[PDB]
Design a protein around this ligand. Structure first.
Ligand SMILES: Cc1cc2nc3c(=O)[nH]c(=O)nc-3n(C[C@H](O)[C@H](O)[C@H](O)COP(=O)(O)O)c2cc1C
Ligand code: F3S
Lengths: 1468, 81
């Protein structure tokens, strides 16, 4: 996987450009997925200019005379298995080309060589042909290109008219041609031999190597496309497609003409996101705009209210944001028109890009730096592409524009300050308007009508107004799913929130709040292909939520132009009041919008004793989908007023459906009613409402960032939710594109439930709301899974070892009414029973269960050691958690209880990762997301971290630690494969297991992580516990583990990969029947989870996030820890009883081993409650069984997977005297970007032989010539030194522990030291101790999550030192944006030259000052002296010689936490 | 290659008709083309009436109360990959 582009600056075509392109494509195979076959690939493609001379010679030797103007060539993929369809396709394209007047010269069969194609690709390889067209009309080139574009669209439409399959016009133009296929990257020039002639000359060349997420290929899905080459994925693809269908109805431009009416379905079907982006890109380019303009309009830059961007750029960005919604996501775009060649980045700049300028007027850019061979004496300048930057080449004039030059060029076309000047923000409009009510009876009545609780309402509503923070839960959910309940449940209890796991990363909110905006627009929609100051005249709100006074201000601003529609239905109606109510409201809103009202308002103030209010979700969904399917949405906006909305999830689901501004009129009334009774203390209503709005906005921003979106306008109407418990027909008609794998209640169930609730509300004189039993247990209703008697019986049975009592316990558990899906599954065998001694032994089953990891910061070290000893004694595998472990447990004790951990976890914070820690294990673990909170990671309160935790994680005591949500080294599946490579390198014995979270669409990620050399997949459910997490993410995020498990199993046995990995589930496991069902569904290993906890002292008090657990499992105090009563024998007895019950069940079924039952579905049946009358949940999507084939359903090869070898072997085969005598050694090599992770294996060797701090610094040293690969020197133990001459790729110094890395440009190169990028992004991610000395600039997120390392760099990028915790980082030169965001501990120095630092640094928790004390001056002096001694850098020497003068320019950056803890007084 | 049909003149359903249909389809191996792989064929088919008792038993085991009038069964071929 990777993109690249070469271009000539002067503009003269040549052959060396194609030569370099092919030389580059030969060197990408080390990134993409390798196949054990060797002939199959993921997809490759190249894009060059047209060789006029070649086709002219062709048409000459055919017999015709060549023309003087240009000659168009078109490449087509036709069907192959048939022949008559080929004739239909030929006659279609011919009768459509001849309809304009161009004279056809003829066809040409492309000579290929099929032998280098794999098997899965040759099965679906279509015929490739070319057509030659001449421009005999004597027309200009632009009309020629536009006419060919119209021809292509018309041909596509026509051939779609006949439903012919596999017909794809790759590219039809007279400026460029495309050669793409499903072969590998190394055999391209041997697949299409036409590219080996000395006549194929061009001035630019683009190439792409894609990465597959499955095994089946499809040729039309190969990159690059007709105008684009995208790398990565796109988060907001659905919302953008919907908004494109909305803009389709009112887009016009005179450049096309009548044929405009032909190009309506601008976005086809069956294409990936990149294809849709490319076709919209091409549409917007053909209309007249240049390439940089449309690039800025499609993926703009983050508009920050800072003084870094000039004013004209700000007006331009505002206009670009107003004209069209963005396309957020990880994108490294390299686009090309016929005149421009542009290469740019997305908003956040996740996937990298690096370029190089030669002396031959040639620019070469791509993902990696060491792709093409260039001698060091010809380079002029190296650089990079940060967040939002871009680089342009103008081929007509033939010039190079960098970021700021191109931006200034663009900011001088139209008066951008005179256009956006015609807008208004509804803030001053409110200030001058507001300056110009319900009793408790009706308030309580209308609150009860919606079934709001009283305590559980004030449990979550008070903490908002009091502080401004959402509530914080303490344990995983066990409440039944929405459809399986029996009381009233609003619609918002059904929609589950989406999130992104591996393909793309989440976005951190508490640290990157400058790139996420919330502005909403009223009156921006319209013609997109036009350009005038009339489009930008609108209303701009700062947030989609609206209070009461602000809503009235907006309303009496709009006045008469709006309309009002009631959202109630008569209760006295028959069984079809909701249906005709929806019909009526749809007809009325359609008529109103036709009449001329540009603003629709939904309201339910008409609720009374004889009319029931429709749930707003369904109402707005129906209205919005109707306006979309009637071509009206771009006319008006949709406004809602709710009497139920209380929490963030409600506003989230209401906006995701497609409303514009949500209004909550009863919540503010209730807040005021509670205020006038004096419960807040001395806070007025103003501060309270401000805190409430702030909390709501922050919750909405968290919900948005949970899946990786930075702008709200691209999230409205996208519908990023899954409906679990709804009928497919309803969610397909009255809702946008969403999924519901199982059916559910329709219009009848909702109507019956809301009618019963209204009857209970308004028939009886209410006095007070019910106490409520949703969050905490009560006696009213909503039965939970954990009850008092259950816990007591389990504790008794485990502390008495009575199997009868444990059986009574299990019977008490599995007796309750159905609460989860697995309750509805009744298992029935067919054969005869078997005596119980005939099934396999008990030990062979006890060795299958495991105890999932729980962070040491969450539960006391006592219980942690107890679990470790128990799991080690029983013979099974334990877990560690995200808190690492204490070194004192790496030795067997005297009693024979090994206090070690059998599985280590690599979380997102790297809070305990170390070379000494990664080898004292058995099988590693990668945490992508946990079952409770998908996109937040473990949260620890401020006071729980004592000195023990502060010494484990090197963190500062008494400081709140929250792990960064996205894996800073996983921005795409490729990086995950690379990380698995490093983890398998560092530990030559352990496996690597990935932890996933059950959701919809997990199948593709399962196929990917199976291709990525992983060994054990860990599907987690939605009912997993937690240490400390918000209530919103607990209640409405995730899916049951059964659904995801079955889905992964099917999709993994379909691609013929199930026989290579093991599947392991967990989440809500209490009895043995659930274990048997999980084994039947496809699991092989099982995680018990929280049961052990309650059998160890947990009694479900749900106060772990407060450090005051009564029994004392989750506490970091002396007193409460002394009340621990857990015993290691209890867990052993528990596991023994579980195994015995499983044995009993299996002997009752009539089988002899679990290995005879895995992957069987003919043993289950669905049973449901017909008297409950709910629409029967068709679970057949789950029990569906794929054909096994020849490989067994459960089979799994012995030993871990295989992985290619790097240079490290050839090092240890040479350093043999070292491992036998321990001698100083010095070696030298040449390093190519094919090599990865240089030195990890040698680090493992020196660790197993000498530990970490056994050798003196510089014991064994390696020199490298060239460009190293990804993760240079990962986990370098003290004693290794690496010096490279050239450049490093990225991830350099990751996990460094005591070692030393040095990078220096070679002495021959004439580059200037401090004006070039020498190392990539996320440098030093999670280092522990050691040094790093570089000579050059750095990439994004430089030195992220650093604690203890010392680094010296000349320059840096955006978001440097993000979430640093310890160590020292010296930076010479300009810094990026948002520098030192979330810094906790350590100290930094910056060599500023123009006092421009205050406009960049984030001043939340850090302060910037000047150096005054001689101690720090001397420390910095010694650091820079050693740096200049190491790398022989002249710029550092120029600084050192002028020390007395240049000492004052340095700024010192110090956290706000070491003001009083530092040994040296930082202030006089 | 070939068609065939079996019908009850009186009009009372039974097992003998379906059994004779299967028996007839078991002896048309010599007309159609012979493959050396021993597996592949040209495609075959049978067409009968709906056995309401079987489907009523099925839906009863599912949990619903079998309705007294005729049921309906629809066979679909959906994508698999
Ligand atoms: C108190 C507590 C702390 C946990 N800490 C972690 C953790 O640090 N990392 C992790 O991956 N999972 C953690 N988990 C989740 C468990 O590892 C496991 O996935 C989950 O508890 C299984 O679901 P269950 O609630 O039915 O046992 C924790 C769970 C609990 C209850
Ligand atoms: S509810 Fe939590 S605080 Fe301790 S006693 Fe149970 S683990």
């Amino acid at each position: 996987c990777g993109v690249g582009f070469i271009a000539a600056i002067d503009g003269k075509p040549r052959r060396s450009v194609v030569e370099k392109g092919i030389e580059a494509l030969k060197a990408v195979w080390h990134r993409g997925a390798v196949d054990a076959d060797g002939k199959t690939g993921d997809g490759a493609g190249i894009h060059v200019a047209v060789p006029q001379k070649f086709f002219k010679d062709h048409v000459k030797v055919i017999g015709h005379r060549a023309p003087d103007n240009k000659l168009a060539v078109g490449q087509v993929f036709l069907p192959r298995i048939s022949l008559d369809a080929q004739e239909a396709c030929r006659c279609i394209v011919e009768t459509e080309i001849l309809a304009f007047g161009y004279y056809i010269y003829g066809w040409r069969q492309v000579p290929i060589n099929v032998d280098i194609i794999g098997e899965k690709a040759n099965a679906t390889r279509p015929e490739i042909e070319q057509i030659i067209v001449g421009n005999n009309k004597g027309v200009s080139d632009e009309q020629f290109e536009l006419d060919l574009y119209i021809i292509r669209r018309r041909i596509e439409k026509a051939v779609k008219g006949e439903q012919i399959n596999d017909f794809y016009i790759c590219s039809l133009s007279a400026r460029s041609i495309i050669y793409k296929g499903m072969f590998l990257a190394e055999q391209l020039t041997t697949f299409y031999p036409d590219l080996l002639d000395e006549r194929f000359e061009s001035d630019f060349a683009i190439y792409h190597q894609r990465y597959s997420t499955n095994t089946f290929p499809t040729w039309p899905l190969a990159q690059p496309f007709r105008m684009l080459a995208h790398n990565g994925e796109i988060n907001t693809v659905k919302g953008n497609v919907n908004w494109m269908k909305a803009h389709e109805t009112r887009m016009e431009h005179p450049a096309f003409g009548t044929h405009m009416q032909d190009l309506k379905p601008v976005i086809g079907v069956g294409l990936s996101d990149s294809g849709s982006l490319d076709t919209v890109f091409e549409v917007m380019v053909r209309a007249g705009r240049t390439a940089p303009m449309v690039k800025m309009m499609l993926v703009p830059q983050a508009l920050t209210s800072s003084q870094t961007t000039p004013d004209n750029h700000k007006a331009l960005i505002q206009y670009c944001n107003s004209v069209m919604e963005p396309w957020d996501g990880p994108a490294a775009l390299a686009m090309t028109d016929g005149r421009w060649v542009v290469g740019g980045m997305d908003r956040n700049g996740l996937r990298p890009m690096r370029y190089t300028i030669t002396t031959d007027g040639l620019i070469i850019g791509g993902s990696e730096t060491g792709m093409v061979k260039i001698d060091e004496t010809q380079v002029i300048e190296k650089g990079r592409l940060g967040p939002g930057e871009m680089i342009a080449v103008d081929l007509q004039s033939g010039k190079l524009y960098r970021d700021r030059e191109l931006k200034d060029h663009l900011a001088t076309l139209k008066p951008w300050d005179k256009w956006v000047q015609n807008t208004t923000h509804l803030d001053e409009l409110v200030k001058t308007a507001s300056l110009k009510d319900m009793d408790k009876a009706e308030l309580r009545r209308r609150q009860q009508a919606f079934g709001l609780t009283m305590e559980d309402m004030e449990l979550i509503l008070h903490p908002m107004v009091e502080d401004g923070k959402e509530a914080i839960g303490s344990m995983g959910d066990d409440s039944p799913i929405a459809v399986l309940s029996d009381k009233y449940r609003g619609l918002h209890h059904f929609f589950r929130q989406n999130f992104s796991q591996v393909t793309n990363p989440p976005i951190d909110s508490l640290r990157e709040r400058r790139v996420m905006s919330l502005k909403t627009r009223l009156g921006n929609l319209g013609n997109i292909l036009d350009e005038d100051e009339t489009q930008t005249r609108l209303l701009q709100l700062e947030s989609p939520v609206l209070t009461t006074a602000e809503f009235r201000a907006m309303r009496d601003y709009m006045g008469d132009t709006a309309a009002e529609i009631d959202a109630t239905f008569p209760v006295d109606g028959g069984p079809e009041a909701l249906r005709d109510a929806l019909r009526r409201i749809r007809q009325e809103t359609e008529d109103a919008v036709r009449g001329g009202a540009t603003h629709v308002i939904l309201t339910d103030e008409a609720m009374g004793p004889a009319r029931a209010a429709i749930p707003a979700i369904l109402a707005t969904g129906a209205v919005h989908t109707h306006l979309i399917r009637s071509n009206l949405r771009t006319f008006t906006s949709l406004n809602v007023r709710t009497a139920e909305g209380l929490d963030t999830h409600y506003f989230a689901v209401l906006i995701g459906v497609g409303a514009t501004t949500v209004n909550a009129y009863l919540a503010q009334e209730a807040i005021a009613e509670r205020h006038r009774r004096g419960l807040f203390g001395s806070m007025p209503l103003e501060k309270g409402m401000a805190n409430y709005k702030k909390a709501i906005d922050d919750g909405l921003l968290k919900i948005m960032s949970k899946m990786g979106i930075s702008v709200i306008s691209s999230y409205r109407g996208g519908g990023n939710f899954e409906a679990i418990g709804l009928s497919r027909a309803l969610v397909a008609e009255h809702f946008p594109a969403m999924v519901s794998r199982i059916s559910g209640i329709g219009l009848n169930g909702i109507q019956k439930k809301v009618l019963e609730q209204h009857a209970t509300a308004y028939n009886e004189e209410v006095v007070a709301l019910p106490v409520g039993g949703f969050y905490r247990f009560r006696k009213s209703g909503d039965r939970h899974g954990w009850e008092g008697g259950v816990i007591h019986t389990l504790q008794q049975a485990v502390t008495n070892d009575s199997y009868t009592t444990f059986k009574k316990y299990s019977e008490q558990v599995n007796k309750r009414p159905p609460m989860q899906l697995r309750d509805l599954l009744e298992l029935r065998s067919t054969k005869a029973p078997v005596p119980v001694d005939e099934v396999e032994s008990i030990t062979a089953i006890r060795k299958r269960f495991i105890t999932p990891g729980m962070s040491m910061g969450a539960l006391s070290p006592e219980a942690h050691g107890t679990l470790n000893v128990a799991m080690n004694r029983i013979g099974a595998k334990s877990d560690s958690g995200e808190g690492g472990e204490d070194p004192a447990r790496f030795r067997p004790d005297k009693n024979g209880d090994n206090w070690n951990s059998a599985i280590k976890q690599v979380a997102s914070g790297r809070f305990g990762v170390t070379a000494e820690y990664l080898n004292q294990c058995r099988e590693l673990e990668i945490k992508v997301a946990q079952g409770a909170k998908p996109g937040e990671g473990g949260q620890l309160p401020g006071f729980k971290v004592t000195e023990m935790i502060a010494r484990l994680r090197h963190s500062t005591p008494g400081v709140m630690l929250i792990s960064p949500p996205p894996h800073h080294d996983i921005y795409s599946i490729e990086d995950l494969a690379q990380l698995i490579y490093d983890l398998k390198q560092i530990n030559p014995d352990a496996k690597v297991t990935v932890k996933l979270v059950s959701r919809s669409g997990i199948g593709t990620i399962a196929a990917g992580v199976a291709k990525a050399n992983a060994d054990i997949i860990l599907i987690s459910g939605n009912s997993g516990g937690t240490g400390a997490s918000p209530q919103t993410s607990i209640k409405f995020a995730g899916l049951p583990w059964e659904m995801g498990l079955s889905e992964v199993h099917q999709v993994l046995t379909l691609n013929r990969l199930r026989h290579r990995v093991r599947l392991r589930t967990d989440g809500g496991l209490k009895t043995g029947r659930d274990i048997v069902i999980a084994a039947m569904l496809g699991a092989e290993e099982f995680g018990i989870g929280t049961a052990s906890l309650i059998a160890m002292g947990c009694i479900m008090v749900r106060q772990c996030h407060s450090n005051t657990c009564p029994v004392g499992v989750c506490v970091q105090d002396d007193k409460l820890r002394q009340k621990f009563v857990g015993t290691p024998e209890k867990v052993v007895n528990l596991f023994t009883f579980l195994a015995e019950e499983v044995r009993e069940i299996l002997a009752g079924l009539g089988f002899r081993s679990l290995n005879e039952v895995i992957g069987r579905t003919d043993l289950l049946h669905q049973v449901s409650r017909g008297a409950e009358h709910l629409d029967d949940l068709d679970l057949n999507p789950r029990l569906a069984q794929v054909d096994p084939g020849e490989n067994a359903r459960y089979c799994t090869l012995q030993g871990r997977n295989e992985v290619p070898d790097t240079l490290d072997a050839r090092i240890v085969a040479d350093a043999r005297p070292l491992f036998e005598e321990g001698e100083k050694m010095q070696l030298a090599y040449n390093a190519r970007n094919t090599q990865r992770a240089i030195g990890t294996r040698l680090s493992s060797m020196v660790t197993r032989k000498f530990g970490m701090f056994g050798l003196q610094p510089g014991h064994i040293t390696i020199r490298l010539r060239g460009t190293a690969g990804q993760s240079l020197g990962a986990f370098a133990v003290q004693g290794i030194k690496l010096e490279v001459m050239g450049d490093a790729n990225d991830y350099v110094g990751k996990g460094l522990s005591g070692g030393t890395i040095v990078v220096r440009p070679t002495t021959s190169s004439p580059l200037e030291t401090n004006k070039n990028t020498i190392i990539g992004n996320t440098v030093l991610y999670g280092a522990t101790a050691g040094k790093l000395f570089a000579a050059g600039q750095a990439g994004e997120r430089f030195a992220v999550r650093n604690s203890g390392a010392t680094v010296v760099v000349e320059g840096c990028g955006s978001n440097g030192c993000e979430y640093m915790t310890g160590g020292t980082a010296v930076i010479l030169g300009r810094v990026g944006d948002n520098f030192a965001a979330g810094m906790t501990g350590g100290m930094a120095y910056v060599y500023d030259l123009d006092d421009s630092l205050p406009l960049y640094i984030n001043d939340e928790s850090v302060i910037f000052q000047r150096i005054e004390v001689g101690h720090y001056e001397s420390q910095l002096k010694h650091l820079i002296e050693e740096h200049v001694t190491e790398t022989q850098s002249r710029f550092a020497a120029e600084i050192l010689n002028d020390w007395a003068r240049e000492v004052t320019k340095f700024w010192q950056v110090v956290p706000k936490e070491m003001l009083n803890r530092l040994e040296v007084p930082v202030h006089l």
